[PDB]
Ligand binder design. Structure first.
Ligand SMILES: c1cnc(N2CC[C@]3(CCOC3)C2)cn1
Length: 185
C-alpha cells in the first residue's frame, strides 16, 4: 500500500470515553483504568464497553492513521458513524454504523454480522487504517508485515460523518492492561 501520504493526525476525544478509560495528556494514548476515573456522565460516553472516539470528523477524501496494539490480548479498531449508539448493548457491525476488526481469544476477525475470520501470518504490533470516503472503502494493513492487507470493507454506507473508533478491551485476565497508542507520522 502507498497510503501513508494521506496520513492524518488523530487525537482522542475525552468526552466520548467510557468513564474507566485514561487518555494521555497528548490525547494519543488510551488504556483501561482499574476503576471509574472521576468524570461526570454525559450523553456522548460509551456506557457498556471500553470505547472512545477520535476528535476528527471526516465527510470526504482519503485518510490514513496507525495504531500500536503491542502486548494486548483483546481490542477493536476502525471507524464509525458520528451517530452510533453510545448507551446499552450493541454488536460492532456495518448495520450499526461500525467498520472495524478485532483480536479476541487468539483470533483476528472483521466486525461483519456474523463476524468474518481473518488470515494473518504475522501477528500485528501496529495496524494501518485507510478510509476512502468517496469510494466507500475501509481497509486495514499489517504494519509489522511490510504493510500487507488484512481486510477491506467495500460498498460502505457511511451515511454521515465518520470518526476514528477505538476499543481497548476489558482486562478480566490481568493480561490486557496495555494501551492503544496512535503512532507518529
Ligand atoms: C463476537 C462479538 N464481538 C466480539 N468482540 C467485540 C470486540 C472484542 C474485542 C475487544 O473486546 C471485545 C471482540 C467477539 N466475538
Amino acid at each position: 500500500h502507498h497510503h501513508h501520504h494521506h496520513m492524518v493526525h488523530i487525537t482522542l476525544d475525552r468526552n466520548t470515553a467510557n468513564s474507566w478509560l485514561i487518555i494521555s495528556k497528548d490525547r494519543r494514548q488510551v488504556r483501561m483504568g482499574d476503576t471509574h476515573q472521576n468524570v461526570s456522565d454525559n450523553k456522548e460516553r460509551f456506557s457498556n464497553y471500553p470505547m472512545v472516539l477520535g476528535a476528527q470528523r471526516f465527510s470526504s477524501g482519503k485518510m490514513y492513521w496507525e495504531v500500536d496494539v503491542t502486548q494486548k490480548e483483546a481490542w477493536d479498531l476502525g471507524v464509525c458513524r458520528d451517530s452510533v449508539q453510545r448507551k446499552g448493548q450493541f454488536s460492532l457491525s456495518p448495520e450499526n454504523g461500525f467498520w472495524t476488526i478485532w483480536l479476541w481469544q487468539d483470533s483476528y476477525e472483521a466486525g461483519t454480522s456474523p463476524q468474518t475470520t481473518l488470515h494473518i501470518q504475522v501477528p500485528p504490533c501496529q495496524i494501518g487504517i485507510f478510509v476512502d470516503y468517496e469510494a466507500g472503502v475501509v481497509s486495514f494493513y499489517n504494519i509489522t508485515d511490510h504493510g500487507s492487507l488484512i481486510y477491506t470493507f467495500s460498498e460502505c454506507v457511511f451515511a454521515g460523518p465518520l470518526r476514528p473508533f477505538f476499543n481497548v478491551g476489558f482486562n478480566y485476565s490481568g493480561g490486557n492492561a496495555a494501551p492503544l497508542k496512535l503512532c507518529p507520522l
